[PDB]
From Swiss-Prot:
Main localization, broad class: virion
Primary role: The VP4 protein is one of the five proteins (with VP1, VP3, VP6 and VP7) which form the inner capsid of the virus.
Keywords of this entry: Capsid protein, Outer capsid protein, Virion
Record's protein name: Core protein VP4
Matching Gene3D superfamilies: Orbivirus VP4 core protein, C-terminal domain (1.20.1280.200), Vaccinia Virus protein VP39 (3.40.50.150)
Species for this entry: Bluetongue virus 10 (isolate USA)
Pfam families for the chain: Orbi_VP4 (PF05059)
Keyword Transferase: no
Family: Belongs to the orbivirus VP4 family.
CC terms in the record's Gene Ontology section: viral outer capsid
């Protein structure tokens, strides 16, 4: 709604800014701490800034909403040599185009969102087993042998029983069909038996594009014309496969493994031949259910037969395949050890298939300019347990990133807050701006604050949350992190992190940029200073900070003694940007008196906490 970034530019760039429409802030070395706070608070949109910032720390500037823009690689702060957030190209300078400049900021700004989400997700991989609302981004960074990845991803085009097709979706080009094949099927299997591997160029391109999951897999590759492979995890068989026996002998049963069976067999007047090969791969796989978690079989659609049968779980289109390529892939979910619970996918069984509807699929989804989003969706569908986060009761520590306040969850605040009470890390959208390429509804900030904060649950806005993690987990979230503080501030974040001790007033907790303007805006619009501070912060709907920690910092810490309290700030490795019980309860009473029903509990909860503690 109101959070803004300070778009800071270096000197060589400063002149272009002056001729724009956003406001301009000229510093000037000194600037005391309080100067910045009262100056920055005057601005209600994003603002440009230039001049000397070198005596300020990164976290101080981030608490202000600073984004660093320059032609140069970095800027010298008081703390670190900070990597430039937005690097303005030479040609962009220079032609002095104010529009191209701003579009440069904006594009790089959209790219920085990933940095914000990734920092939160990395903390979550360190602290959680369960992941809800997941998609390819989570799978990609997950240890499939430890993490459990759940979600409700957009289901791809499939075929069973049954039938549905389309509807059609817009799509983009991707990798060549056969490496794309490995792309969506390879995720949790430790061992792959690949029959009909060919010349291995396909496998070697997978190694090149995906070093990680290639290396973690043991590859048994079968083909009479297969060349040598000096890769230690590629065991090469020049055997022609006609029975399960050819595969059983290259297995170690005395050790537990998830195995995947991949069949791409084809040969050199008709091709009832091609049919008996596809059927064979399926049959071999079915016989070997119990040893294999899953199978992917080559599936060419016959020309003569209008209907026919096969052994399948799903049949789907192939990403990167040609428009005229009348071939699908047969996914078979089997029994056999697996790091992913795929029980929701029906056991592979005998399936009737009408050529015509399987003919449409090709025509709807294939094409050398299609496949990118198909590939994504196949990947997510095969490898994520379909579960509704709000309805799932868990035994393991869980993470709940970027899904709660998706529009599909509208009007389900109770169960949303129920997640935020127990999640290790959860996010909720609170942004009120009107607010593009993002389809979430906003939770009222004051409600979040009042419901979210517990002894064990830390509740902060996105930027606060990051600054907290910078401070508490220095190599989970580095100081040098490129991210957009305004963006971060569209989210509330809850953390399973104990109140700090001493309960110091760190930036993560206390920024309150714009508070003075907000009190005036409250008074000229809806009228009724430590008590006024609380009443304004809540009533403004502009802030998300942690009440529990804040109440702890106010009473237990602050008086105190100026000297012996910084000291406990030093020490705490904490910084700031600013240098009673009956007052706080007066604020809360005034707040609930201005709005009952629409809140609050909770409120009474904090009220009956302050008058006891
Ligand atoms: N109530 C709910 N339960 C389970 N999944 C949900 C959900 N509401 C939305 N989702 C799903 O969550 C996904 C949001 S994309 C979020 C990606 C991921 N959590 C991350 O860290 O970036 C979408 O696939 C959406 O379908
Ligand atoms: N019974 C069988 N067992 C293993 N491979 C077989 C086979 N019958 C035919 N083949 C092999 O199957 C291959 C099909 S070419 C398949 C393309 C290959 N997977 C690639 O990506 O390059 C042929 O090279 C042929 O040698
Ligand atoms: N900040 C942010 N990061 C992401 N990474 C993946 N998705 C998102 C998102 O929606 N927001
Ligand atoms: N198949 C596949 N699709 C993706 N889309 C985004 N990441 C991936 C991936 O790792 N594999």
């Amino acid at each position: 709604p109101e959070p803004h970034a300070v778009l800071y530019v270096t000197n060589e760039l400063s002149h272009i800014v002056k001729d724009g429409f956003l406001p301009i802030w000229k510093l000037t070395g000194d600037e005391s701490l309080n100067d910045l706070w009262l100056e920055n608070g005057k601005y209600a949109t994003d603002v440009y800034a230039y001049g000397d910032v070198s005596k300020w720390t990164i976290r101080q500037l981030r608490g202000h909403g600073f984004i660093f823009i320059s032609t140069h690689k970095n800027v010298q702060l008081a703390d670190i040599i900070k990597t430039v957030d937005v690097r303005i190209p030479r040609e962009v300078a220079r032609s002095h185009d104010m529009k191209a400049f701003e579009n440069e900021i904006g594009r790089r700004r959209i790219r920085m969102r990933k940095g914000f989400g990734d920092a939160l997700r990395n903390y979550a991989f360190k602290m959680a087993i369960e992941f809800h609302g997941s998609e390819a981004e989570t799978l990609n960074d997950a240890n499939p042998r430890l993490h459990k990845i759940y979600g409700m991803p957009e289901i791809p085009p499939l075929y069973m029983e049954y039938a549905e097709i389309g509807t059609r979706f817009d799509d983009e080009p991707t990798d060549e069909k056969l490496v794309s094949m490995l792309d969506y099927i390879v995720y949790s299997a430790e061992e792959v038996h690949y029959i009909g591997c060919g010349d291995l160029r396909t496998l070697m391109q997978f190694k090149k594009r995906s070093p990680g999951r290639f290396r973690r897999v043991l590859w048994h590759v079968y083909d009479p014309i297969a060349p040598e492979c000096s890769d230690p995890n590629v065991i090469v068989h020049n055997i022609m496969v006609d029975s399960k026996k050819d595969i059983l002998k290259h297995m170690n049963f005395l050790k537990r493994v998830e195995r995947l069976f991949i069949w791409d067999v084809s040969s050199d007047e008709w091709e009832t031949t091609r049919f008996a090969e596809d059927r064979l791969g399926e049959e071999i796989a079915y016989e070997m259910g119990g040893a294999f978690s899953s199978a992917l079989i080559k599936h060419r659609i016959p020309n003569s037969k209008d209907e026919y049968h096969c052994i399948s779980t799903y049949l789907f289109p192939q990403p990167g395949a040609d428009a005229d390529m009348y071939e699908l892939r047969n996914f078979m979910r089997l029994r056999g050890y697996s790091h992913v619970d795929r029980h929701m996918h029906p056991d592979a069984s005998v399936t009737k298939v009408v050529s015509r509807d399987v003919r449409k699929m090709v025509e709807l989804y294939h094409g050398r300019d299609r496949g990118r989003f198909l590939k994504k969706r196949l990947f997510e569908h095969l490898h994520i347990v379909r579960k509704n986060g709000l309805l799932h009761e868990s035994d393991e520590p869980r993470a709940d990133l970027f899904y709660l306040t998706n529009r599909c969850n509208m009007g389900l605040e109770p169960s949303i807050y129920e997640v935020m009470k127990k999640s290790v890390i959860a996010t909720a959208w609170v942004g009120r701006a009107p607010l593009y390429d993002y389809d979430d509804f906003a939770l009222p900030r004051s409600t979040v604050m009042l419901n979210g904060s517990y002894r064990d649950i830390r509740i902060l806005d996105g930027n606060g949350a990051i600054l907290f993690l910078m401070w508490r987990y220095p190599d989970i979230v580095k100081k040098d992190l490129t991210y957009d503080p305004a963006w971060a501030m569209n989210f509330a974040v809850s953390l399973k992190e104990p109140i700090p001790d001493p309960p110091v007033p760190d930036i993560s907790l206390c920024r309150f940029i714009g508070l003075r303007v907000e009190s005036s805006v409250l008074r000229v619009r809806n009228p009724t200073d430590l008590s006024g501070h609380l009443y304004v912060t809540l009533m403004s709907g502009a802030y998300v900070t942690d009440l529990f920690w804040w109440f702890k910092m106010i009473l237990d810490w602050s008086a105190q003694n100026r000297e012996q309290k910084l000291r406990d700030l030093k020490r705490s490795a904490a910084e700031v940007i600013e240098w009673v019980r009956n007052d706080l309860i007066a604020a809360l009473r005034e707040y609930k008196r201005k709005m009952g029903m629409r809140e609050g509990a909770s409120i009474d909860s904090w009220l009956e906490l302050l008058r006891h503690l």
